[PDB]
Write a protein that binds this ligand. Structure first.
Ligand code: 9YF
Ligand code: 9YF
Ligand code: DGA
Ligand code: DGA
Ligand code: HEM
Ligand code: HEM
Ligand code: HEM
Ligand code: HEM
Ligand code: LMT
Ligand code: LMT
Lengths: 534, 534
């Protein structure tokens, strides 16, 4: 076939035969955690493309028009050109509503996917040496992704977006030397300003996407260069990777998971409404709603402003407003996240070149601090949303603010305590299995009447008839007998009937032969590791 | 110093020591041609950054306002928001005029730098195998760079831009099935349309810059991967590169030439006016000027429309306008440029893996066709500008159109004839020197009265006392004696006086010793090439 001619013509010119061989043969581990990041990547792809489709219709201008579009309930209402063009996307373009909702849902999925991916990186310990650079890059990404998404939903100039813009401007003006100067620099004047929405539009469609794309490219390039970490397991060492090659069996799975995420987004974009701007009306600074919170990924920085106890300083001709302290708090919160691996180094007392991951149970301090930060962030989030929470679940609004205040101290401590003790209990169960074997659950009575539970050893048994303890290795310990194969089906066939018996027996024989062959190869690989380590 | 600690910390994590060594040791030839492309690259950098500064002030909206800005001569004039914000850049922002002019001059320098770089690639033969891909990429770049720049100067919605937009729309609507449909797709309706300037704005600031950046990145990456071509010379072969390493002596020169181009742009941006929009007035479809040509890089496609002899087809209920044929012509013109290396292959009868460049004199057909295309393009350009040409140089406007028409046939033929014969004469001079030696110009009279000119041989001399001819090698042949060193200064020192004589003599001795040492090393390298080729 002419495919060989194409390949020849390519390689005779570019000599890629050595390199692409090395690329296709790279090995990637197959844990389920290790494609959370791919979700964020796929969401970003969708964010790009749907965004580019929205720009052929959106007009980022704060100057007014008397609306005369397809949405009849606002004919004659004087509105910003931004809001009018967003409405024309929603109503006058075939399927523009579908697209706009997909863009928004993709933004939410992108941010939460980054959050969960970062949680995996934090708990499993993958940020450690040499990979802390990917942490410093990645934290910047999850900051900018929020910064972008915020100004992304600020653009339509509806009533719910402009209040968040008002909040941002009023926070900037309050800074204790340069606030007025920084505000006049950013907005080009007092708020609302003529040049405001175009600066934010270009910041949203060109600048921050360009930076995110560059940083994501560098991130993935670095992950590819220094190969992926892995969990401890049979035959795994600090100096090797066990998994599947990037093709055929991994690239197709990446394509398939891309398809799944893509289609999931296209479903939820048509089936759930998001940001129904047409019933919010255009922005004017005199109007506000009871539930006027920012997007979900910004609710934490709303909740901070809700829980600060109004401490304000007056110094003669000057004043530090009460909102400077939430800026300090949120900055400290961001600094701690940004610089984490080094404050981990200074107290952990090690600088080793780790390539194997820690199970979160085996590192109770870090996982306890992670759950502590999770409850802190969640209390900030729900305090941001407490207006809705109190309205729906009928808890007094003052009680919600005080729950946020006192909880941001107390609840983290309770989280740390419970998380630490639970982790210790988990690893105690692991040791109990490794030194006594699995508890099958089969209870038998001896002739003496003693009730005994037969335990099924994993390692060899002493001549007294009891297991010899194994050393814990960091790999997961099986805790039941269905996880050793002992509940697998003996019958073969589909629904409504069996396979013929000859096929049945031969298939089961081949299955068991493979099951012992893979055990043998992993066992020999582990023994080779022992020999090669001395 | 702590620099060593930084380097250690880096390489212990990323292991870049092998790779960056290989990068810094890459060799690049030093011909003056081989940084024309860098000019285009630097211009593109400037185009990006100055453009990003212009977007904090520009508002791409076709909806109107009564102007009240700093430019008093248009107070009260109702104008588009685009035009008003461009005026506010020019007059209300400190130094916005300086920036806007720099952006425009950078665009012109970018396009002409691409043109001259491509001319180098065409004449020297660098497009040949394996590098034709860089040709196919590069031609696309020099198309899109023009497409962008056109819509770049269309954005302000002034009177001179909107006429070009009118021309584009009226050409699109004339296509012989889909013209009306394609126009309604692109513009969102009839011209001028509400969504027009925002589609062009996003196409100008996001889409085409993103594509140009990606293609330029791929272009430079490919040039780096397969190493740069070189001219034939002493010690040069198809299998090696002779020049300087990318650092220290090349990277600093790249920085320095970047500085020179940058500062040149900053000078000419403040010293020459470009596109003085403030005296053109806002666009309205009923008004036009005598000199209303598009930008310079679009004048060719204007000139085509000027020289087409109005051939129009009528078919019952349908008509093919007279402007369809210029579309066909310009498309043929672009196709020929895009697909050139293969129509070079089919008639040249070779598919070899060339790495040494051809001097343009040695390939008279291709260089003659190149000058033929140059005169064709220049006649198209000046026909595009003939309204100005006839007004200034006092040649009748009809005579200019007929000069364009008949010249686009005749002048290419004359160019081919003259270019071919001149190239043959050049290489004849080269052979004459190589078989008779340099003509010094020293004329002496023999005792017989015969007037002789002493010739200075390059190669050995036969026992009859006359040079043995050398075979031509494609490298330049020296044609005078000042190019062999024989006019170099014997004195040393600055203005107003000499160096002391001891310093003088020692410096000259070292100079001549180095001059013979480099000759010896190149001679030995060439002999090694002969031995290694057999
Ligand atoms: C939770 C139950 C305590 C609670 O709600 O306490 C509120 C203040 O929050 C708290 O201390 C919450 C403490 C949370 C602790 C951390 C978990 C204050 O009560 P409030 O919501 O203003 O109700 C009014 C009465 O106070 C007032 O006496 C009465 O005269 C009425 O005016 C009544 O409406
Ligand atoms: C160049 C000199 C020839 C020239 O200009 O020819 C013009 C048409 O172009 C040409 O053939 C240019 C040929 C170029 C050949 C390729 C090089 C036509 O003359 P035109 O410009 O209209 O001047 C009018 C008189 O023709 C008309 O008789 C007279 O009564 C007036 O009306 C006069 O104004
Ligand atoms: C991190 C947040 C620091 C808030 C400091 C407020 C000081 C202030 O504006 O304090 C001023 C305020 C009066 O002080 C008070 O309310 C006294 C208590 C201040 C906070 C003590 C902890
Ligand atoms: C490349 C440009 C092709 C132009 C074809 C015009 C045919 C036409 O619309 O021809 C129609 C037109 C009548 O024909 C004529 O003027 C006759 C001459 C046509 C061109 C002959 C070369
Ligand atoms: C849009 C943002 C991001 C994208 C597209 C992304 C993508 C990826 C992908 C695909 C992987 C490999 C597969 C996997 O680990 O699941 C990865 C690994 C990694 N990510 Fe991210 N990620 C993003 C954000 C972050 C954040 C927020 C952090 C941490 C603060 C981070 C730190 C890391 C590190 C250190 C690795 C390598 C860990 C290892 O090799 O085991 N990344 N990233
Ligand atoms: C090529 C990059 C992007 C482009 C061109 C783009 C374009 C746009 C445009 C024009 C709008 C306003 C028009 C409308 O409401 O439909 C918008 C809104 C929005 N953007 Fe983007 N965007 C891009 C990337 C992103 C990214 C990376 C995120 C998230 C981090 C994001 C999140 C949002 C959100 C949440 C909205 C509000 C949607 C709505 O209110 O309906 N966008 N985007
Ligand atoms: C903005 C557009 C372009 C940029 C930034 C660019 C940049 C460069 C640079 C820096 C080089 C190496 C140094 C030099 O040759 O002077 C190069 C080489 C080259 N360029 Fe371009 N160029 C552009 C457009 C083009 C065009 C329009 C063509 C042809 C149609 C082209 C074809 C080539 C080829 C084939 C080479 C390699 C030739 C060799 O190795 O001798 N490029 N380019
Ligand atoms: C990041 C990429 C770019 C951005 C953000 C950008 C931005 C802009 C903006 C906003 C304008 C109109 C405002 C004004 O008149 O001052 C403009 C005009 C223009 N652009 Fe760009 N541009 C970019 C790249 C380019 C490129 C690559 C070219 C050339 C190929 C180009 C050529 C032009 C020209 C000729 C004008 C007209 C200038 C004038 O009329 O004063 N631009 N650009
Ligand atoms: C993936 C991306 C592209 C990769 C490019 C690198 C691989 C190039 C493969 O190139 C291809 O190799 C096979 C190897 O048998 C050659 O195949 C040929 O081998 C011999 C010559 O050696 C012939 O007698 C035989 O009939 C034919 O199959 C093709 O002539 C060559 O075109
Ligand atoms: C350019 C981009 C960065 C490149 C990084 C790769 C190069 C890293 C260089 O790393 C640096 O090498 C020098 C080589 O003598 C080492 O230098 C050290 O050598 C020996 C140990 O081998 C010491 O006794 C000696 O006192 C010290 O000079 C540094 O401890 C190491 O930090």
């Amino acid at each position: 076939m002419s495919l060989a001619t194409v390949g020849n013509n390519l390689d005779s010119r570019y000599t890629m035969a050595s390199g692409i061989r090395r690329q296709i043969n790279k090995v990637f581990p197959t844990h389920w955690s290790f494609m959370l990041g791919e979700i964020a990547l796929y969401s970003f792809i969708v964010l790009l493309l749907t965004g580019v489709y929205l720009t052929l219709f959106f007009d980022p201008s704060i100057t007014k028009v008397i609306y005369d579009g397809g949405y009849l309930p606002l004919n004659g209402v004087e509105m910003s050109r931004a809001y009018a063009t967003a409405l024309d996307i929603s109503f006058e373009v075939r399927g523009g509503l579908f697209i706009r909702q997909m863009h928004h849902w993709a933004a939410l999925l992108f941010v939460v996917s980054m959050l969960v991916h970062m949680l995996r990186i934090f708990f499993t310990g993958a940020f450690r040496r040499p990979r802390e650079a990917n942490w410093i890059i990645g934290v910047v990404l999850i900051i900018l992704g929020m910064a972008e998404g915020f100004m992304g939903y600020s653009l339509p100039d509806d009533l719910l977006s402009g209040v968040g813009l008002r909040i941002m401007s009023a926070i900037i003006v309050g800074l204790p030397i340069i606030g007025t100067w920084m505000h006049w620099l950013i907005f080009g004047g007092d708020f609302p300003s003529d040049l405001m929405l175009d600066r934010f539009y270009i910041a949203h469609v060109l600048i921050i996407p360009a930076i995110l794309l560059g940083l994501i490219a560098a991130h993935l390039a670095l992950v590819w260069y220094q190969k992926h970490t892995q969990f401890p397991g049979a035959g795994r060492t600090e100096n090797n990777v066990i998994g599947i090659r990037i093709m055929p069996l991994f690239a197709v799975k990446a394509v398939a998971f891309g398809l799944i995420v893509f289609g999931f987004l296209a479903l939820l974009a048509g089936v759930t409404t998001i940001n129904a701007i047409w019933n919010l009306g255009p922005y004017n600074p005199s109007q506000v709603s009871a539930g006027s919170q920012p997007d979900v990924y910004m609710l934490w920085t709303d909740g901070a402003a809700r829980v600060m106890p109004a401490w304000e300083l007056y110094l003669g001709n000057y004043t530090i407003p009460a909102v400077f302290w939430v800026a300090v708090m949120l900055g400290i919160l961001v600094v701690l996240l940004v610089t984490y691996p080094f404050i981990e180094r200074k107290f952990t007392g090690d600088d080793a070149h780790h390539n194997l991951l820690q199970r979160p149970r085996d590192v109770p301090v870090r996982t306890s601090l992670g759950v502590m930060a999770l409850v802190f962030y969640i209390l900030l989030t729900v305090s941001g949303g407490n207006d809705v929470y109190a309205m729906q679940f009928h808890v007094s609004l003052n009680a919600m603010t005080w729950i946020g205040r006192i909880g941001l101290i107390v609840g983290p401590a309770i989280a740390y305590f419970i998380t630490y003790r639970l982790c210790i209990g988990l690893q105690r169960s692991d040791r109990e299995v490794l030194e006594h074997g699995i508890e099958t659950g089969i209870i038998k009575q001896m002739p003496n009447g003693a009730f005994i539970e037969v335990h099924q050893p994993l390692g060899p048994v002493d001549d007294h008839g009891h297991p010899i303890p194994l050393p814990y290795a960091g790999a997961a310990v099986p805790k039941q007998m269905n996880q050793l194969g002992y509940a697998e089906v003996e019958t073969r066939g589909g629904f409504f009937g069996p396979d013929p018996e000859d096929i049945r027996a031969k298939a089961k024989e081949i299955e068991h032969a493979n099951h012992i062959e893979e055990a043998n190869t992993l066992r020999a690989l582990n023994e080779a590791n022992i020999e090669r380590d001395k």
